[PDB]
Ligand binder design. Structure first.
Ligand code: 1XF
Length: 223
């Protein structure tokens, strides 16, 4: 067997076709994009591990990941380490999202997935992020989403040269990649509801010198 960091990745990958991606969620006013990005990468690894997939609980992460700040931001790697230490993460149905930080309500009964660690993509290496998406699955990533051009995206492959790759303020999920009208892109799942962008998704420029810092905080959990 030839490992992940070696040889040719396919030119087009989309896990929305293969049942590795849950429907688009809406984080509301709570600044918990790290939680939705974390559960999104955990859902994809749950599908490859068990063959079954299920909507996991970002509220579990908001209320229980003490290393993060609930609605005040957080890192996706701390959520992965939490699930590893906690031995489990609850389902969305058993731990619904309320849009606020509350007390930790984890119960092992509603456990739907586990995690045994994580791996951080080499800093700014878009080729390595591409190989990871093609071989591991959906990868949690952080970007600069403060620009007006990003927030009012609707169609096409998004690119803005003013995007600060050193101000990663929003967490999303790379559910694939490809090419549209001569512009390479990452297929990115956001958490601003289905009515944002293109059905909740945005195609962000790929191989344009790590636009918006797409590969500066990329990671995936291990199951
Ligand atoms: N042996 C390898 O690492 S090749 C992986 C690969 O297919 N990369 C690519 C494939 C198509 C387009 C762009 C890239 C890129 O380099 O970002």
């Amino acid at each position: 067997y030839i490992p992940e960091w070696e040889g040719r990745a396919p030119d087009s990958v989309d896990y929305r076709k293969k049942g590795y991606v849950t429907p688009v969620k809406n984080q509301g006013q709570c600044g918990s994009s790290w939680a939705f990005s974390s559960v999104g990468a955990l859902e994809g690894q749950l599908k490859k591990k068990t063959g079954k997939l299920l909507n996991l609980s970002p509220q579990n992460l908001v209320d229980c990941v003490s290393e993060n700040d609930g609605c005040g931001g957080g890192y996706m790697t701390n959520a992965f380490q939490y699930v590893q230490k906690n031995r489990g993460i609850d389902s969305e149905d058993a731990y619904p999202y309320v849009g606020q930080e509350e007390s930790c309500m984890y119960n092992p009964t509603g456990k739907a997935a586990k995690c045994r660690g994580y791996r951080e993509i080499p800093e700014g290496n878009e080729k390595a992020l591409k190989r990871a998406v093609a071989r591991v699955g959906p990868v949690s990533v952080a970007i600069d989403a403060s620009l007006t051009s990003f927030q009012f995206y609707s169609k096409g492959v998004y690119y803005d040269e003013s995007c600060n790759s050193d101000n990663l303020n929003h967490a999303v999920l790379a559910v694939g990649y490809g090419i549209q009208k001569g512009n390479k892109h990452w297929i990115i799942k956001n958490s601003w509801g289905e009515n944002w962008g293109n059905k909740g998704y945005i195609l962000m420029a790929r191989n344009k010198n790590n636009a918006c810092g797409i590969a500066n905080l990329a990671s995936f959990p291990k199951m």
